[PDB]
Amino acid sequence: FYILVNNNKRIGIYYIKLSIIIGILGIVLSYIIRVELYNSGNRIIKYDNVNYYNMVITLHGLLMIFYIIMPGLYGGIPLYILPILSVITDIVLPRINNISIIIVLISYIVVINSIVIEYNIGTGWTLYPPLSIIGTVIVNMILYGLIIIGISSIISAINFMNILIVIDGIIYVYIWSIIITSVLLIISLPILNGILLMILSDIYFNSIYFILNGDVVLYQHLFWYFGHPEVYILILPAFGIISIILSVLNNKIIFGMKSMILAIIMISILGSIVWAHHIYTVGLELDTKIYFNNLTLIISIPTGNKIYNWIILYIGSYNILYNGYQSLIFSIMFIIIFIIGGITGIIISIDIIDIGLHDTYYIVSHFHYILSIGAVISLLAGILLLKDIIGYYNVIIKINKYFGLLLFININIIFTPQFIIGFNVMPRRILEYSDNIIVWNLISSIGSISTILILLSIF
Amino acid sequence: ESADALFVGTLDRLTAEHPHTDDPRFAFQSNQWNNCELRFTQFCRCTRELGEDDPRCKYQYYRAQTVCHEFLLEDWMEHRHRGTCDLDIMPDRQVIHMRG
Amino acid sequence: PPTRLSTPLYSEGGAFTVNWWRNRYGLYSRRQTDPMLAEFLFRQQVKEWFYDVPSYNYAALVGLALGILVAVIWRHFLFNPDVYVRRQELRKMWPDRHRQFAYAVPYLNPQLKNLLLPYKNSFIDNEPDYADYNPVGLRPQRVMAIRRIPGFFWAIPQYFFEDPLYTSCSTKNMQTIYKKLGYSEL
Amino acid sequence: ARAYCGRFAFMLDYPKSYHPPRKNEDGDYVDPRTDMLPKCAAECSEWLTEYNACVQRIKMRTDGRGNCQGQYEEFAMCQDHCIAHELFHYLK
Amino acid sequence: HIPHPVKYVGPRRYGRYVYGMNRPPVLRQVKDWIDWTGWNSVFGGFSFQVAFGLMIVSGVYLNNYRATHTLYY
Amino acid sequence: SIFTPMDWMFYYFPNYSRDKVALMARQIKIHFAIGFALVFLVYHPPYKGADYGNFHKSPLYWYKYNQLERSGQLQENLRIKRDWFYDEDP
Amino acid sequence: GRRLLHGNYFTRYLFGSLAVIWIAEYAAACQYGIPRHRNPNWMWSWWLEKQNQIKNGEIPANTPGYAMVKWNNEAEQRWLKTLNVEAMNEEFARRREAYY
Amino acid sequence: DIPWPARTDWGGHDPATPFAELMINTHSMFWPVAIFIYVSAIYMVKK
Amino acid sequence: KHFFTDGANDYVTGWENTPPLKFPASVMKPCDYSMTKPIPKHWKLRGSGIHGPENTDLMKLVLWNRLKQKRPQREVPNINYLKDSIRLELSVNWWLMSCIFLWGPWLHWGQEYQKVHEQPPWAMKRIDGLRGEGYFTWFLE
Ligand SMILES: CCCCCCCCCCCCCCCCCC(=O)OC[C@H](COP(=O)([O-])OCC(O)COP(=O)([O-])OC[C@@H](COC(=O)CCCCCCCCCCCCCCCCC)OC(=O)CCCCCCCCCCCCCCCCC)OC(=O)CCCCCCCCCCCCCCCCC
Ligand SMILES: CCCCCCCCCCCCCCCCCC(=O)OC[C@H](COP(=O)([O-])OCC(O)COP(=O)([O-])OC[C@@H](COC(=O)CCCCCCCCCCCCCCCCC)OC(=O)CCCCCCCCCCCCCCCCC)OC(=O)CCCCCCCCCCCCCCCCC
Ligand SMILES: CCCCCCCCCCCCCCCCCC(=O)OC[C@H](COP(=O)([O-])OCC(O)COP(=O)([O-])OC[C@@H](COC(=O)CCCCCCCCCCCCCCCCC)OC(=O)CCCCCCCCCCCCCCCCC)OC(=O)CCCCCCCCCCCCCCCCC
Ligand SMILES: CCCCCCCCCCCCCCCCCC(=O)OC[C@H](COP(=O)([O-])OCC(O)COP(=O)([O-])OC[C@@H](COC(=O)CCCCCCCCCCCCCCCCC)OC(=O)CCCCCCCCCCCCCCCCC)OC(=O)CCCCCCCCCCCCCCCCC
Ligand code: HEA
Ligand code: HEA
Ligand SMILES: CCCCCCCC/C=C\CCCCCCCC(=O)OC[C@H](COP(=O)(O)OCCN)OC(=O)CCCCCCC/C=C/CCCCCCCC
């Protein structure tokens, strides 16, 4: 059979396959954006059809996060190797594992069908009210997808937590990363469901939470209470993969295993109580802003320890071993890229600096370096490491120095200018812009078209 | 004619002599929504005692305009004129203490 | 860390000790099925986690972060004027909430604000004392600091009397320049 | 028998430095205490609101009876305590 | 868990019920039953309501009577 | 302990650190109190810290201050270099 | 039989937490000097004077607040057309006679 | 005031208020620290 | 206790790490060979040496844990155990009694007083002319 299969390793493959398929739509949406931003004036989107652009950015953000990266890093690799890293045979809850991947597909079909049938309007991937609750039915459809996706995420989190009961070996660092990510989902998802229901209530049940005398900022607190743990849920599995790749490909025992494990735990605890650095410009109390700013900076301490522990893993490795394997290059590239993304995150953590850089392309570049480069490269690196175990072929990616170099150069061309544009300044979620920002936007656009061409070379 | 006369009498007086500065009761917060509601309630009570024509209540309205946007005031003034403004309901006709 | 089960492990009395940890570690464990095996696994975990020197660094960090977290939560409820828990003031119109207004001014003047506000001149180059004077009196009059903020501020001299242009850029001098032209009052 | 109670100097918070008094537009020095009165009143706002309430209560009396001296003395004591901490910094 | 003896010190058997003859006074029987089944459940169960009841009903004196006699205006 | 490598704590204070589990708890408790104390003792206290006349002047302050005072630099530094907007056009 | 939590954990951490919250609040009030006397009344001085007049008998009983103001909204103008305080008092007087 | 072509404007440009200067100075204050963090780590990415 | 714990409250399988204290040490003892004296050099390893059923105490522990599951009569626990088993049940029952016989009477009294005096007996009477019951929990005002 193909749909009835409960084998966890098969389901892991399905997660990877589905993420690539949905990735194409996400890439298409991303390509539409940079083509439009090539220069001032409409290029592929009519001025009378600006609503479509708002939908493109809204779906680009939603699909890439919930439908592409999260299934790939939290559903794909973990379902394949996690029961193997544990001494157990298969996943604890086989039937739940089957329904989780099916749920992800159905939610994807609902989302894309809504593009085709409903009027195309957008409110951003964060769905801030009141804009989200004064829109058309496409917003209702997107909410159903998120709620449905939430069901799959929570049941998958329950599945991984049960490994603690049955694990017959040692809890490796990678296993810890998945377990702690599951803990974050369990504590953050129910809060997300509650606020999403309130959005539906206003949209569909004549609720008045998001009109005058009802604080709209209420949504931002509850949403970001899940929002920031989500970004840490995306990256923590990537950290686990990097730890395995560096140790395995260098024949070096992981240094400071317990320090690595405690760093992951510390990040989750801190990541659950710093959500309001997304709300600096709303006008919070003085003491509130100081607290979140102070605690946000503290997240760098555990994150820094992991970076240094990774570096010493690569240092001193035997020279005779060939170092040009794509998996090793991607793992090393992650350290270089993540540091850039994290440092810029610390810059925008300072709230007064953030006043100028909120809702600008500097924030875009910040999370693209971490997610579009780092997370993707970590997912690529893990899949490459498991090529023999997974057994896929008909691609030239294992030893391809051209692909690694071209990818690194061109992605940096896309997003380095966006840091510069942030100070110029160019707002986010914008289709037109002043003529004097064209040069930097043009350079990034040339970077985007180049990256897409490179992907065709792997086949 | 005293240095601390502003504070003496009322905390209200502080912004009556300095309309464009922060009110002591709401200076700690950037959000001034509660400040606008207090100012409007003060204007409503002035008219009840002194009447609209009184210059004092005219200035109280000006104080409200200093912190209340016009789109809010137009809506709230409409409710006040009809008689459905919850701020201006006479105390003996309030329902806050009823049924709990 | 002993390597023989015959040698006992020293334990203190209290709610977080070796004995306290042993009693609860194996409550949910399917692997600690007999004394010999249970002790071996218990000492294995204790050796791996509590005898790891770098682990104690994270213990300090979680304590500090949680301590700040609890204090800020508690401070808002206790002192923040805008936070209501009792209902007496919420049953009255805004002008009548006299008890709540008592929190306003003291909550507006925390110690740290007074200490650090004078150090604005480490950031602003022109007229760092533009907002120092306020005749209303809700806050103290500010006086610019005489030294740079410790740390990463190597751009400016260690003390402001070493800067030849510091006095010329003060709000007083600029006010003198513009008043001489009749340009503005400030 | 004697004017003051002696203390260690570390207990006595004598001003470290001297700030000259502000000068009026006319050119005459303004009293430091008068400049500090508005600030210290704010620091004693709680007592001031209690005094302010008393004024309104006695205002709404048909009879002439009523005084607010008790509340005023509490406010005055608080304001002066604030002044004492900072006044000598402006006095030679 | 600290092992400890059974604290019940009352009679362990009253004998066969014979039309309610040769049995203790009713109040003594109630005391024995609670001793047998544990006073800890009684105190825990009643603690919440006692605390709430005392706090609310204390206001009859603390909030109502005292306030009338203690208002400086 | 604060800013202390615990290997030093193990070495120099064996008896105190004999119970590692208890030692870990004290590490958490000690740093919890510090964080709690900072908020309520350093940040919270109202109407304090405004004695700007008592700025701390460390020995390094006086060393540099006297060095410039001895020469004319201190007088020159404090002098207002410009107090007019427009220069006179010849 | 092995115990994981405090022997009396539920009562300990419920009453104990409530006690600590109450004691902390009292300390906070002392530090800031907040008045702790409870007033259940609105503080509008003019209105309280009118209520005292009703209690003294200067103003007839059951007289509405809108009958005493210098500015009336539209809804109050509607009610004033049907207001008869004298009739209301007579009706109450009749009820008392019937009851006794 | 307004964006200009091909400008890095690293940290901001053209402040007109004392607060605007503060924003730029804060970024410049931390910028050298950011370089130190990057350079020190990257230099050790090697066998 | 309600919740199942592998270590202590293992009622699903009934496994116990140690035998009952009734048995003499000669008959059965806890599986502890930490105090075994050093093996003479001339002795040779015949068995695996692996921790498992080759050790007599572990074999007897496994055997007893299976054969204890059939017994002629109940092994009666003491009243302390029986109290703990239904601690929540007994306490909830007493909580119901407290609601009926403590809360009910004074809540009824307050409503009757409120009828006559317009406010509960534990509240300050208002002079502001507003009508209605007002607050109930006075200390939260
Ligand atoms: C009280 C009141 C009572 C009222 C009573 C009223 C009753 C009402 C009833 C209501 C319920 C009705 C449904 C009941 C279902 C019963 C299930 C059951 O028991 O089945 C046994 C039955 C056993 O079959 P069998 O009779 O033994 O014969 C099977 C074969 O002999 C060989 O066996 P097999 O299992 O191997 O074969 C199946 C499989 C074999 O074929 C293959 O697998 C082909 C090879 C793979 C090629 C690569 C595919 C791409 C990679 C995907 C990777 C991820 C996969 C994840 C796992 C699979 C998820 C489906 O082919 C398929 O079934 C199709 C596979 C589809 C894969 C989809 C992958 C993603 C596609 C992405 C699309 C991207 C474009 C976007 C736009 C379009 C969006 C739709 O199940 C099946 O095998 C068939 C299932 C068919 C039902 C599927 C329904 C899907 C609905 C989707 C939502 C559509 C809504 C929106 C429409 C939009 C259109 C545009
Ligand atoms: C005034 C108030 C006073 C109150 C006093 C209250 C006293 C309470 C006493 C509590 C005593 C606990 C006793 C049991 C200890 C654990 C034993 C255990 O689990 O046995 C394994 C047992 C399986 O039996 P087994 O066969 O022996 O397992 C063999 C191993 O798998 C094979 O592994 P292996 O042999 O290789 O390694 C052994 C060990 C290896 O691992 C260990 O040995 C870990 C040892 C450390 C654990 C943490 C201890 C506490 C540390 C101090 C924290 C203080 C914070 C203070 C804050 C104050 C703020 C005011 O493995 C495990 O422990 C596996 C389970 C780990 C679960 C972790 C879940 C995430 C929690 C966060 C991690 C802890 C971070 C601590 C802080 C870090 C920063 C300093 O696990 C299970 O039964 C699994 C059940 C899974 C259920 C999941 C769903 C639960 C519901 C979730 C709700 C949401 C949770 C949110 C969490 C948020 C986290 C950030
Ligand atoms: C002011 C007046 C008004 C007051 C209103 C109060 C309202 C309260 C609402 C409560 C709603 C009901 C909830 C409980 C329903 C069930 C009741 C029941 O059956 O009780 C009797 C029964 C008594 O059990 P027993 O075995 O007969 O005990 C006999 C003796 O009592 C002696 O037993 P033992 O001492 O020997 O121990 C055996 C027993 C002892 O356990 C119990 O008996 C449990 C009793 C609990 C009762 C509820 C009290 C309130 C608990 C508050 C907890 C707050 C968490 C922290 C929140 C932080 C927020 C920032 O152990 C178990 O049964 C194990 C259960 C599994 C525990 C799993 C915990 C997972 C979460 C761990 C923490 C995660 C955060 C880590 C952070 C640090 C990271 C480094 O309880 C159970 O069997 C219930 C267990 C199953 C339900 C567990 C639910 C766990 C939920 C975890 C949520 C974690 C969220 C984390 C994130 C939060 C922040 C984002
Ligand atoms: C000259 C002037 C003179 C002036 C003189 C003035 C005189 C003034 C006198 C003042 C006196 C003050 C006295 C202070 C010292 C107190 C000392 C003391 O004894 O403290 C400890 C004492 C009891 O603590 P303890 O010793 O730990 O208890 C022993 C236990 O047996 C421990 O044993 P355990 O732990 O085994 O206990 C049993 C436990 C065993 O646990 C288990 O079995 C394990 C499982 C536990 C977890 C359970 C999970 C959930 C269970 C699910 C089932 C739920 C069923 C109910 C469902 C309801 C559905 C609607 O289970 C339970 O207890 C829980 C289950 C039972 C049902 C729970 C029902 C829900 C509870 C939560 C809600 C509470 C709020 C309700 C509000 C109303 C309704 C909305 O604490 C208190 O009584 C609190 C102190 C209150 C102070 C109030 C002060 C203010 C009021 C002043 C009044 C007088 C003023 C008059 C005016 C004067 C003006 C001058
Ligand atoms: C995987 C995704 C991911 C990850 C890991 C992070 C990690 C971090 N993020 Fe990010 N973030 C996003 C995804 C992510 N973020 C997204 C998607 C947004 C925008 C959402 C939206 O608005 O739509 C965002 C937005 C965002 C904002 C702005 C929110 C707004 O106002 O709009 C801020 C502000 O501080 C921030 C901070 C941080 C910080 C401080 C970290 C830290 O974890 C980084 C820590 C890492 C380092 C610091 C580098 C490693 C450490 C060292 C090299 C040594 C130590 C270094 C120092 C002490 C400086 N993020
Ligand atoms: C995982 C998340 C993810 C990923 C990969 C990307 C990838 C890219 N994104 Fe981004 N983007 C977001 C998440 C992501 N993005 C979010 C959350 C926003 C904010 C939404 C909002 O404004 O509300 C955003 C916003 C955003 C904007 C701003 C829109 C606006 O405000 O007007 C732009 C503009 O160019 C952009 C461009 C790009 C480009 C050019 C790429 C890529 O082309 C970069 C290079 C990548 C490739 C060439 C493809 C490589 C292959 C994969 C990524 C799939 C791999 C799959 C597997 C391994 C299974 N993105
Ligand atoms: C959320 C509202 C719910 C109302 C519930 C009513 C029932 C009351 C009893 C249960 C709730 C506990 C609160 C009881 C309070 C009793 C005393 C009281 O009235 O306090 C009021 C006072 C403020 O009221 P006002 O005077 O109107 O505001 C002044 C300016 N801010 O309230 C408080 O300060 C207490 C409220 C918070 C109590 C909870 C504890 C706070 C700290 C939480 C820390 C959380 C982080 C983690 C802690 C870990 C600890 C191990």
Ligand SMILES: CCCCCCCC/C=C\CCCCCCCC(=O)O[C@H](COC(=O)CCCCCCC/C=C/CCCCCCCC)COP(=O)(O)OCCN
């Ligand atoms: C039986 C199990 C019961 C478990 C119940 C768990 C309840 C809590 C679940 C999580 C939700 C937390 C509540 C949400 C708190 C939001 C507070 C908020 O947004 O307030 C901020 C201010 O809040 C703060 O100062 C931030 C404090 C951070 C609160 C975090 C609470 C939840 C933390 C959960 C982390 C995970 C658990 C950690 C456990 C210990 C780890 C060692 C807004 O301030 P302003 O808008 O400026 O308004 C101020 C006055 N106008």
Ligand SMILES: [O-][O-]
């Ligand atoms: O979100 O960072």
Ligand SMILES: [Cu+2]
């Ligand atoms: Cu964030």
Ligand SMILES: [K+]
């Ligand atoms: K364009």
